[PDB]
Swiss-Prot record:
Subunit structure: Part of a multimeric complex containing STXBP1 and STX1A. Interacts with STXBP1. Also part of the brain-specific heterotrimeric complex LIN-10/X11-alpha, LIN-2/CASK, and LIN7. Component of the brain-specific heterotrimeric complex (LIN-10-LIN-2-LIN-7 complex) composed of at least APBA1, CASK, and LIN7, which associates with the motor protein KIF17 to transport vesicles along microtubules. Within the complex, interacts (via PDZ domain) with the motor protein KIF17; the interaction is direct and is required for association of KIF17 with the cargo that is to be transported.
Organism expressing this protein natively: Homo sapiens (Human)
This protein's domain notes: Composed of an N-terminal domain that binds Munc18-1 and LIN-2/CASK, a middle phosphotyrosine-binding domain (PID/PTB) that mediates binding with the cytoplasmic domain of the amyloid-beta precursor protein, and two C-terminal PDZ domains thought to attach proteins to the plasma membrane.
Subcellular location: Cytoplasm; Cytoplasm, Perinuclear region; Nucleus
Gene: APBA1
Protein name, UniProt field: Amyloid-beta A4 precursor protein-binding family A member 1
Tissues showing expression: Brain and spinal cord. Isoform 2 is expressed in testis and brain, but not detected in lung, liver or spleen.
Residue ranges occupied by any PDZ domain in the UniProt entry: 8-83
Record's function text: Putative function in synaptic vesicle exocytosis by binding to Munc18-1, an essential component of the synaptic vesicle exocytotic machinery. May modulate processing of the amyloid-beta precursor protein (APP) and hence formation of APP-beta. Component of the LIN-10-LIN-2-LIN-7 complex, which associates with the motor protein KIF17 to transport vesicles containing N-methyl-D-aspartate (NMDA) receptor subunit NR2B along microtubules.
Amino acid sequence: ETMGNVTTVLIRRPDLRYQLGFSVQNGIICSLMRGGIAERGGVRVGHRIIEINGQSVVATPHEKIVHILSNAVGEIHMKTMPAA
């Protein structure tokens, strides 16, 4: 599993008030807040989140993907691809 163009991201989130800092739609990063944790994480726009903290969310719906990101803090391992 995890083949090809995968760019793992580590988000280190202090708590829930420190939101990701990137706008995602359906798992695809649409925008990134510069200076935010996501930038520090290595998140880039035009990337598709394929996994979050050990669960492949690439087949996970919008809500779920967002709900999961919204509640996860600490060292967060995501796997992103160039949305291809």
